[PDB]
Amino acid sequence: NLNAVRETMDVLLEISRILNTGLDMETLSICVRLCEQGINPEALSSVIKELRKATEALK
């Protein structure tokens, strides 16, 4: 299982690189675990866009 999830983490990078996300590998790993929980991914794409705006408002 621990061997499987490394291979899945490597293949899920590819489909997010071709679709040109703003996600890097670390935030990809957190968001792949968060989407697998069951919380609607259509809303998670919006909370990330709001988090990345509110952190830039401080800078």
Partner: protein
């Protein structure tokens, strides 16, 4: 679980390249922004709906690659539905286009004016960048070196 991975996310957005009480403030603004949206096959179709807009907007092989990968992605399901809704949030050659000098059977045809006319344009966007680069490096430094007396770096403000 995920709310402990969220702490690693809050460490990533904070500059690592102090850093212990600014994290407690950024964590407050993170949690305060997080729950607003959360309080209030048809899945590969969402990728196909953007591959159509790829094909209309030029760039044929990218859409032909995209439809080649959505067959292998079906041979974890909530992840690609996140990727389709983060598809325009991203960061802002080839020797062949008209060589029939290879092969064993190539079809005889004429000119079209949408292959070789847009193969000199594939390079014209490059030559028109590499000189616009020259105007975006001498301007960004002469804006520092000449404004008016009393303008510069904030080390005089120390």
């Amino acid at each position: 679980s995920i709310t402990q991975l969220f702490d690693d996310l809050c460490e990533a957005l904070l500059p690592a390249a102090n850093r212990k009480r600014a994290k407690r403030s950024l964590k407050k603004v993170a949690y305060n922004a997080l729950f607003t949206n959360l309080f209030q096959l048809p899945a590969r179709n969402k990728i196909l709906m953007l591959s159509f807009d790829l094909r209309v907007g030029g760039l044929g092989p990218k859409a032909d690659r995209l439809e080649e990968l959505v067959e292998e992605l079906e041979a974890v399901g909530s992840v690609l539905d996140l990727l389709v809704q983060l598809a325009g949030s991203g960061p802002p050659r080839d020797y062949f286009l008209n060589n029939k000098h290879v092969g064993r059977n190539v079809p005889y045809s004429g000119y079209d004016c949408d292959d070789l006319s847009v193969f000199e344009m594939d390079v014209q966007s490059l030559i028109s960048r590499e000189e616009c680069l020259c105007h975006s490096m001498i301007q960004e430094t002469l804006q520092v070196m000449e404004a008016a007396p009393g303008t510069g770096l904030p080390t005089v403000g120390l």
